């Protein structure tokens, strides 16, 4: 129940890693969604890739 | 960079085609390219419209 806005998120350059799978990062922004859950957690950096 | 990569330096300073033909050649740098205080001589486009 809400208007989203991926290029904020995505332009800003603190993020370390960025992968998006089936979609891609600049179509998000016209693209929507029945929901969108975000799931939260801390991880060791090596472990990232998991 | 790289072919078929977006970014802040893919889109607005430096484009590669997609079908790109060559050779991306790169070395870090320590010596020249880094002060203390920073290198402020070094420009990129922030936004672009």
């Given at each position: 129940?809400?208007?989203?806005?991926?290029s904020?998120?995505?332009n800003?350059?603190?993020?370390?890693?960025?992968?998006?799978?089936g979609?891609?990062?600049?179509?998000?922004?016209?693209?929507?969604?029945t929901?969108?859950?975000?799931?939260?957690?801390?991880?060791?950096?090596?472990?990232?890739?998991? | 960079?790289?072919?078929?990569?977006?970014?802040?330096?893919?889109?607005?300073?430096?484009?590669?085609?997609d079908?790109?033909?060559?050779?991306?050649?790169?070395?870090?740098?320590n010596?020249?390219?880094?002060?203390?205080?920073?290198?402020?001589?070094?420009?990129?486009?922030?936004?672009?419209?």
């Amino acid at each position: 129940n809400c208007v989203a806005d991926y290029s904020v998120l995505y332009n800003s350059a603190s993020f370390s890693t960025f992968k998006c799978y089936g979609v891609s990062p600049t179509k998000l922004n016209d693209l929507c969604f029945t929901n969108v859950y975000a799931d939260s957690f801390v991880i060791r950096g090596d472990e990232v890739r998991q | 960079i790289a072919p078929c990569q977006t970014g802040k330096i893919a889109d607005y300073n430096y484009k590669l085609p997609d079908d790109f033909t060559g050779c991306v050649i790169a070395w870090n740098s320590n010596n020249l390219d880094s002060k203390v205080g920073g290198n402020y001589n070094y420009l990129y486009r922030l936004f672009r419209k």
